[PDB]
Amino acid sequence: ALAQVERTAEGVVLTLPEGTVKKLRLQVMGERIIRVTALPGTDFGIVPESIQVVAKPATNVPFSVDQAGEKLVLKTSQVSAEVSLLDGTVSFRDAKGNVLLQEENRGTFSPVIHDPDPVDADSYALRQEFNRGSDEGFFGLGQHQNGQVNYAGENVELTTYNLVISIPFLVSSRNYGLLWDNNSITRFGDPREAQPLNQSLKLYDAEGKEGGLTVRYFVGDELKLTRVEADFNHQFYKQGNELENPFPEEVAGAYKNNTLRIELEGSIEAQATGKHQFKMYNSGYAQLSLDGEVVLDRWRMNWNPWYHNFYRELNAGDKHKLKVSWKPDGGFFHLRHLDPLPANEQHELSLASETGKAIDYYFVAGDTKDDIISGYRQLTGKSVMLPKWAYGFWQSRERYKSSDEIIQNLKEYRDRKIPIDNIVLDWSYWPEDAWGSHDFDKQFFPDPKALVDKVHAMNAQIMISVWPKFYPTTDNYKELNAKGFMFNRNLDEKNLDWIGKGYLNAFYDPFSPEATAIFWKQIRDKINVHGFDAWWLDAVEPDIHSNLTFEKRKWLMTPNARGNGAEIFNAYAVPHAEGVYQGELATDGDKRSFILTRSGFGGIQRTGSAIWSGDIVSRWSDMKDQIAAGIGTNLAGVTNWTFDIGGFTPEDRFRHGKKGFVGSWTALDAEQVDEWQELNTRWYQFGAFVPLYRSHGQNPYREIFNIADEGTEVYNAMVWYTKLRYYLMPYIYTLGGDTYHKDGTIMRGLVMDFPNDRKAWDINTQYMFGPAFLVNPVYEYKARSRDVYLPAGSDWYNFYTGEKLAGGQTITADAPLARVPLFVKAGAIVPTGPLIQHVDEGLNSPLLITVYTGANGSFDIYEDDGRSLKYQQGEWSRIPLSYDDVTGTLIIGDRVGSFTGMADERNIRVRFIAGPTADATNFDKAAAEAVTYTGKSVSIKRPR
Ligand SMILES: *[C@@H]1O[C@H](F)[C@@H](O)[C@H](O)[C@H]1O
Ligand SMILES: [Cl-]
Ligand SMILES: [Cl-]
Ligand SMILES: [Cl-]
Ligand SMILES: [Cl-]
Ligand code: NI
Numbered sequence: 056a057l058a059q060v061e062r063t064a065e066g067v068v069l070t071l072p073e074g075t076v077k078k079l080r081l082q083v084m085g086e087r088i089i090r091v092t093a094l095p096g097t098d099f100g101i102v103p104e105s106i107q108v109v110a111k112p113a114t115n116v117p118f119s120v121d122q123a124g125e126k127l128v129l130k131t132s133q134v135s136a137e138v139s140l141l142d143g144t145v146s147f148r149d150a151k152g153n154v155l156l157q158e159e160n161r162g163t164f165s166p167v168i169h170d171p172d173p174v175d176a177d178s179y180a181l182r183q184e185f186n187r188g189s190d191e192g193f194f195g196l197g198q199h200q201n202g203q204v205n206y207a208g209e210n211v212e213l214t215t216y217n218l219v220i221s222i223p224f225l226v227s228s229r230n231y232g233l234l235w236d237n238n239s240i241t242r243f244g245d246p247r248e249a250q251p252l253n254q255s256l257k258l259y260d261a262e263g264k265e266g267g268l269t270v271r272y273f274v275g276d277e278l279k280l281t282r283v284e285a286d287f288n289h290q291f292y293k294q295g296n297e298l299e300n301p302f303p304e305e306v307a308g309a310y311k312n313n314t315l316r317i318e319l320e321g322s323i324e325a326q327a328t329g330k331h332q333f334k335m336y337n338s339g340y341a342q343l344s345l346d347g348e349v350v351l352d353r354w355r356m357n358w359n360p361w362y363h364n365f366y367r368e369l370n371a372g373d374k375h376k377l378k379v380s381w382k383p384d385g386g387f388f389h390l391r392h393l394d395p396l397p398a399n400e401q402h403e404l405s406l407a408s409e410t411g412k413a414i415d416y417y418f419v420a421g422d423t424k425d426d427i428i429s430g431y432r433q434l435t436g437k438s439v440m441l442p443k444w445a446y447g448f449w450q451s452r453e454r455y456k457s458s459d460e461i462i463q464n465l466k467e468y469r470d471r472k473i474p475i476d477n478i479v480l481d482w483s484y485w486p487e488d489a490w491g492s493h494d495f496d497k498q499f500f501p502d503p504k505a506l507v508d509k510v511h512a513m514n515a516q517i518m519i520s521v522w523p524k525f526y527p528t529t530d531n532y533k534e535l536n537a538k539g540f541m542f543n544r545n546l547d548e549k550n551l552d553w554i555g556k557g558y559l560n561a562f563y564d565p566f567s568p569e570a571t572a573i574f575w576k577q578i579r580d581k582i583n584v585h586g587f588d589a590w591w592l593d594a595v596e597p598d599i600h601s602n603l604t605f606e607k608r609k610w611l612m613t614p615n616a617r618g619n620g621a622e623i624f625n626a627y628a629v630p631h632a633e634g635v636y637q638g639e640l641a642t643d644g645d646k647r648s649f650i651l652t653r654s655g656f657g658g659i660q661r662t663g664s665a666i667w668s669g670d671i672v673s674r675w676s677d678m679k680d681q682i683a684a685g686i687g688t689n690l691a692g693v694t695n696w697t698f699d700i701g702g703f704t705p706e707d708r709f710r711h712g713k714k715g716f717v718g719s720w721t722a723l724d725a726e727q728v729d730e731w732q733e734l735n736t737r738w739y740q741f742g743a744f745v746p747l748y749r750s751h752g753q754n755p756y757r758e759i760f761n762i763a764d765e766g767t768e769v770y771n772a773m774v775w776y777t778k779l780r781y782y783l784m785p786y787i788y789t790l791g792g793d794t795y796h797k798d799g800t801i802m803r804g805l806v807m808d809f810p811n812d813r814k815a816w817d818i819n820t821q822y823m824f825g826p827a828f829l830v831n832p833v834y835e836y837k838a839r840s841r842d843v844y845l846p847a848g849s850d851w852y853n854f855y856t857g858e859k860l861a862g863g864q865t866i867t868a869d870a871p872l873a874r875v876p877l878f879v880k881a882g883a884i885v886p887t888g889p890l891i892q893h894v895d896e897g898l899n900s901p902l903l904i905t906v907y908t909g910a911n912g913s914f915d916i917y918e919d920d921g922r923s924l925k926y927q928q929g930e931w932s933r934i935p936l937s938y939d940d941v942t943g944t945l946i947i948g949d950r951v952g953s954f955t956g957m958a959d960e961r962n963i964r965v966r967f968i969a970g971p972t973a974d975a976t977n978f979d980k981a982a983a984e985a986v987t988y989t990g991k992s993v994s995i996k997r998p999r
Contacts, residue, residue, distance in 0.1 A: 107657030192228030329395030338386020436661030443921030447476030491525030571634025673702030792917030882910030943997035
């Protein structure tokens with residue numbers, strides 16, 4: 056009873072005679088890429104046009120189809136897929152006959168359970184399982200906030216949130232990755248949503264007596280009520296600002312005035328054995344203790360809570376002591392958990408989605424992780440070049456309040472000769488009762504074009520905040536609405552925002568290009584006309600009303616152009632940013648646009664956008680977590696990424712003192728100054744080594760000169776790392792060029808460059824910044840050193856001192872306040888330029904080429920005009936650098952390419968580092984051999 060085979064031009068289509076899956080289509084997408092579509096029906100046409108994939112089946116890719124017995128082989132020069140004619144399961148082999156990925160079953164289709172709205176009869180909950188009992192690593196998946204780099208054996212929920220951005224591209228430690236092309240909420244590992252604490256556990260209160268947990272309510276230190284609760288849950292608002300479950304009547308007042316405190320106490324007993332996951336979702340100060348030990352200490356701003364996870368081994372029957380402390384300060388809280396899966400699934404690959412019409416994924420083969428990302432780029436679109444100024448320093452604030460305030464702070468950087476390219480105008484520049492009109496309050500921003508012109512005249516660019524949000528009072532709302540493009544259920548719910556008495560508001564519907572075209576014409580007419588340089592597309596999750604349930608959030612986007620809110624929950628930002636990008640293209644066909652946006656999904660990089668992690672807090676745990684967040688995003692195939700240096704929201708201890716509202720650090724209560732300055736110093740260090748370097752957030756003010764005084768150690772350290780960023784621009788912008796021309800990745804998990812080192816795989820507090828720099832952020836208050844693992848098979852130089860160390864060891868790296876531990880890989884060729892104040896100053900600049908000896912090297916410096924689209928017609932250049940360590944020779948090869956404004960002649964000096972040197976970072980004054988390069992190859996011998 057074998058399956059029937061139909062040879063298509065793109066591959067094959069099996070018609071299985073058994074089971075739920077009726078048809079199984081394979082499509083050759085490229086030399087290294089095969090699409091798999093498992094359909095519970097006969098009409099593939101029911102499958103929605105991809106939002107991620109812009110790639111269509113290849114036409115010029117040789118492939119062969121051989122059939123024998125009960126196995127079908129379809130292969131290219133690089134990938135081999137063996138399908139069973141019995142059950143329809145696919146097995147992927149490399150070009151040398153090794154099992155990369157094997158499907159377990161044909162996939163589990165279930166009824167949709169998480170769509171609050173009416174469900175298409177041909178929609179299902181999807182699940183697919185692969186590689187049971189593997190030992191492989193798993194990476195990518197997007198920007199997540201639980202410290203995971205190697206996801207293997209654990210859970211990730213690919214939902215969309217302020218702080219979370221799912222990109223369903225999974226990369227293995229083996230030579231493949233895959234794109235799971237589903238727009239709805241998706242889960243890695245455990246299929247189930249994390250449940251209430253009492254759904255897979257037995258609960259005992261303080262009295263030891265079975266039941267629920269002991270829930271004490273405190274006002275101040277005064278106990279005001281004790282009682283036992285099953286599922287303690289104040290996770291969401293139902294409407295407006297009203298909790299879903301209100302607080303006991305007798306402390307309800309304390310909640311609203313921040314005097315409320317709470318404790319939970321009891322014992323948990325799992326009925327099953329194995330690894331359990333736990334999630335403490337919260338705002339305010341929360342602290343969880345288990346077995347007498349603290350497991351979680353977290354604070355998050357009240358309006359932006361999130362989950363804090365940890366796994367732990369449990370034996371059934373075993374009771375364990377649980378203690379929790381929650382000072383809500385008006386925030387939220389729930390406690391969730393999941394018991395272990397069936398043991399045979401304990402170590403498998405599992406992806407599930409909430410709604411879809413078919414299991415649809417793309418197998419991507421690649422000999423290196425860069426090769427694998429490259430497949431992702433080809434499916435979902437090339438990461439289009441950002442303007443060169445985007446890799447310079449960005450200064451933002453929530454918020455500047457006038458044209459004057461912006462020009463003043465920019466001028467202050469220039470006066471202090473501290474480099475900066477970009478300043479940002481955040482929300483609330485419009486008349487307060489016209490959010491969405493895109494007008495400029497005449498009191499504070501009387502002449503926008505003059506303000507942009509003053510920024511430009513100071514050789515900076517300016518970016519501006521634009522939401523998908525409209526008040527129904529405004530004409531722009533009315534215009535979108537008459538075409539049916541407004542999501543109106545938030546108006547019905549009467550959900551007012553947080554501005555003034557509070558306004559009625561709705562978000563538009565970007566899932567139709569007729570809609571995004573209007574959105575774009577609106578901002579074109581109102582904002583673009585004054586010459587702003589970039590768009591800060593905030594709130595694109597969307598976050599229509601903060602803190603409603605995710606079902607409400609789903610419900611609110613129904614109906615959109617693509618069905619329900621649930622069917623497209625992760626995808627909002629792509630079409631939204633696409634419209635802005637496409638309009639800009641239509642407007643100026645020779646200027647690079649830039650978008651910064653707070654959400655994404657597969658393909659976002661095709662809109663010339665960078666993403667950031669949104670509203671993180673000014674905590675150390677958060678800074679640390681940002682490392683895994685950026686890693687996971689780059690390894691998901693989206694490299695242009697950043698965060699708010701210093702965190703979006705500090706605690707109250709920082710925002711407000713005895714001297715009132717804290718702007719400058721001078722207004723801080725004395726006892727806080729130290730941590731505010733150290734947290735910012737450490738974060739600026741980290742910031743200069745992520746793809747985009749950007750300071751932003753709520754008060755205190757975040758300019759370097761508002762964090763500390765001139766001359767102080769911390770001021771000088773922050774200025775030093777900013778300068779270093781610009782010294783490094785020839786290196787950095789090369790990475791920038793590479794994102795497009797070489798499908799490159801800037802912020803690299805260690806698996807990309809040391810894939811054969813299992814111990815590197817798991818590391819979540821270090822990463823490669825480009826090919827040369829091993830970056831190791833200090834993430835602990837008052838730490839003056841940190842463990843650093845030096846990966847095996849390479850030697851390493853201390854960037855600051857020149858000391859050479861061997862890899863394959865962990866060291867205790869010196870980390871004084873002023874320096875983040877930084878190491879260069881033996882063989883790096885690092886180009887630097889002169890000190891500059893903004894990127895254009897350094898065009899055609901003199902170069903210092905620094906060769907870190909001990910291994911061969913290779914680095915081709917990428918240059919172009921930095922602003923135009925001419926690079927797409929070939930207007931760019933590469934200056935090839937090649938180092939041979941045996942002969943000790945650096946070859947500066949023949950220049951490749953050319954572009955308008957490129958200097959034919961370049962002054963280049965070359966130096967070699969081989970050990971300790973006082974000039975390790977003294978770029979201007981270092982001894983080095985000088986060369987007048989004219990595009991012709993020239994060799995420089997290392998000194999004897
Ligand atoms: C969206 O809201 C504001 F506009 C901005 O300051 C914040 O950083 C972002 O989350
Ligand atoms: Cl200038
Ligand atoms: Cl200048
Ligand atoms: Cl200048
Ligand atoms: Cl200048
Ligand atoms: Ni200048």
